[PDB]
Design a protein around this nucleic acid. Structure first.
Ligand SMILES: [Mg+2]
Lengths: 114, 80, 53, 54, 54, 108, 46
RNA sequence: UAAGUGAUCUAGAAAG
RNA sequence: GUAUGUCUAAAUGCUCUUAUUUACUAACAAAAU
């Protein structure tokens, strides 16, 4: 019952491998886990303007974003991500990408950096 | 703490310097004249041999001179 | 691995059959109790030693 | 009558105890040694440990 | 203490870390301890060493 | 098969893996790698100190670690990777070898 | 605390990620160099 | 002629 | 300290991949020789 709980109770018949298999079988059917744009909490490094309503969301402002994987990676084996945000006033989907060549981000049809 | 009991031409490289060092230490601790007196009090034939022994004490005297000390001259005078 | 080894050296040690028992999955990590993992039938009668290392 | 093979995963020590018949024991020992040198699972475990420790 | 003329160890001088210095040390230790709920054990240890060495 | 070729003398130490090895098994590829490593080790053991290798070269990338593990007894023998996608996967394309592989009732 | 993003995997400004990227570049770069030289040699031959 | 006997704190769980 | 709130009428088995993690959480804490 307590966040540092050592052992979760299992039923008396719990073939772990079998259980895993079952879960897998019922993971394609599952709504969540079988989808993109999984949530995340992030502060905004770019400090940018929301292109619709010009709301000047500043640096380090916290948002409940959606992180999604971009299939087209950078180079070969180092992934890059789309990080969706909403502007506070108008609900326009701002987002950005993390191209690690410059050790920084790229704006993605959301707003503009300034 | 210890009793001054000490067993000392041929025997003079490292050993001689060690002896010198010891003497210096003694001087530092005691006080020159006092130290000398103390030495005299013990039998002490090795550090200061009293008998002249045909210019064998000359070496000892020289050694003593090398590290600032007294009584050597007196000893020398005594023997002639 | 043990089973494989047994299979490899069946007739050398006079082994009829090497049965890997269908234990309960957690038997690996039941430290209180235990169970025979690899039961081992003989062809002729084995003359075993006392419990030793 | 039987044997209890035992492998200390955190020290990589192994030992077994129980009943034996003629010619078995050396072979068993050899097998154990082989396993310790290279079992896949054990190797994996070792790797994991290394990773943890860096 | 030595007389420079005669080279005699003519006096003694006993030492003790003044209470103020002790207090300072204690304060330093406290500081090291305080503001260290996170810190990598090693960092803390290093700090302690530094203090102690000083 | 386990194609083990000495490029100096042309000695192909071909271990024929039998179908009875894979009976009632899982995580099969991994197992196979381990088996291969074991075989290699055995081969090394068999070879005397004069005839033993220096660089055991491996074709694939992920045949290194198991081999290394198995070859801790022989630290003098280095295990080498390669950029070359070498064509020893066409050992079964050779006829006689293929035939031999087919006609095996044991590990050989 | 201040900047949250610093405790995220995806953040590229995180140092680990940067290191990884560098490693990737370094390996790839090396490969390119190896190939580049070969290419140059070929050109020369031609 | 006589050294060398004994004094031994602790000790984890939750939430924040 | 892993926030939160509104919203609710009464195909089957199969196997194969792993020396990893699109991992998530930051309420917690922050210095040198
Ligand atoms: Mg509170």
């Amino acid at each position: 019952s307590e966040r540092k709980a050592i052992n979760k109770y299992y039923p008396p018949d719990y073939n772990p491998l079998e259980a895993e298999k079952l879960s897998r079988k019922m993971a394609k059917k599952l709504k969540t886990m079988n989808k993109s744009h999984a949530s995340i909490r992030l502060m905004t490094p770019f400090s940018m303007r929301c292109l619709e309503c010009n709301e000047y969301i500043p640096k380090s402002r916290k948002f409940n974003g959606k992180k999604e994987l971009l299939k087209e990676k950078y180079l070969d084996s180092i992934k890059i991500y789309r990080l969706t945000i909403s502007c506070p006033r108008c609900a326009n989907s701002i987002a950005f990408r993390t191209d690690p060549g410059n050790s920084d981000y790229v704006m993605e049809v959301g707003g503009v950096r300034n | 703490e210890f009793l001054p009991m000490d067993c000392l031409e041929e025997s003079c490289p490292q050993g001689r310097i060690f002896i010198k060092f010891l003497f210096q230490e003694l001087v530092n601790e005691l006080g020159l004249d006092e130290l000398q007196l103390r030495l005299n009090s013990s039998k002490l034939d090795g550090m200061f041999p009293l008998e002249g022994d045909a210019e064998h004490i000359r070496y000892s005297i020289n050694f003593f001179t090398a590290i600032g000390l007294g009584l050597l001259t007196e000893d020398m005078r005594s023997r002639l | 691995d043990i089973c494989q080894i047994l299979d490899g050296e069946l007739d050398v040690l006079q082994i009829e059959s090497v049965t890997k028992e269908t234990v309960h999955p957690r038997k690996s990590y039941k430290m209180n109790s235990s169970a025979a993992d690899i039961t081992m039938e003989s062809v002729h009668e084995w003359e075993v030693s006392k419990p030793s290392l | 009558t039987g044997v209890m093979i035992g492998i200390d995963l955190a020290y990589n020590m192994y030992d077994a105890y129980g009943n034996w018949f003629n010619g078995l024991k050396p072979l068993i020992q050899n097998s154990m040694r082989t396993i310790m040198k290279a079992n896949p699972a054990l190797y994996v475990l070792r790797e994991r440990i290394r990773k943890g420790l860096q | 203490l030595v007389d420079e003329r005669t080279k005699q160890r003519t006096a003694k001088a006993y030492l003790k870390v003044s209470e103020e210095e002790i207090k300072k040390f204690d304060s330093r230790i406290r500081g090291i301890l305080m503001a260290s709920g996170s810190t990598t054990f090693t960092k803390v240890a290093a700090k302690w060493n530094t203090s102690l060495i000083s | 098969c386990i194609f083990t070729l000495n490029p100096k003398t042309g000695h192909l130490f071909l271990k024929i893996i039998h179908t009875s090895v894979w009976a009632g098994q899982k995580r099969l590829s991994q197992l196979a790698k381990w088996k291969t490593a074991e075989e290699v080790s055995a081969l090394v053991r068999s070879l005397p100190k004069e005839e033993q290798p220096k660089q055991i070269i491996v074709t694939r990338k992920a045949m290194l670690d198991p081999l290394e593990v198995h070859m801790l007894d022989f630290p003098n023998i280095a295990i080498r990777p390669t950029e070359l996608r070498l064509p020893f996967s066409a050992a079964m394309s050779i006829d006689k070898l293929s035939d031999v592989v087919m006609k095996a009732t044991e590990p050989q | 605390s201040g900047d949250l993003n610093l405790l995220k995997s995806w953040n590229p400004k995180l140092m680990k990620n940067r290191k990884k990227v560098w490693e990737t570049e370094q390996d790839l770069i090396t490969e390119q160099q190896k190939l580049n030289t070969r290419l140059k040699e070929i050109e020369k031959e031609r």
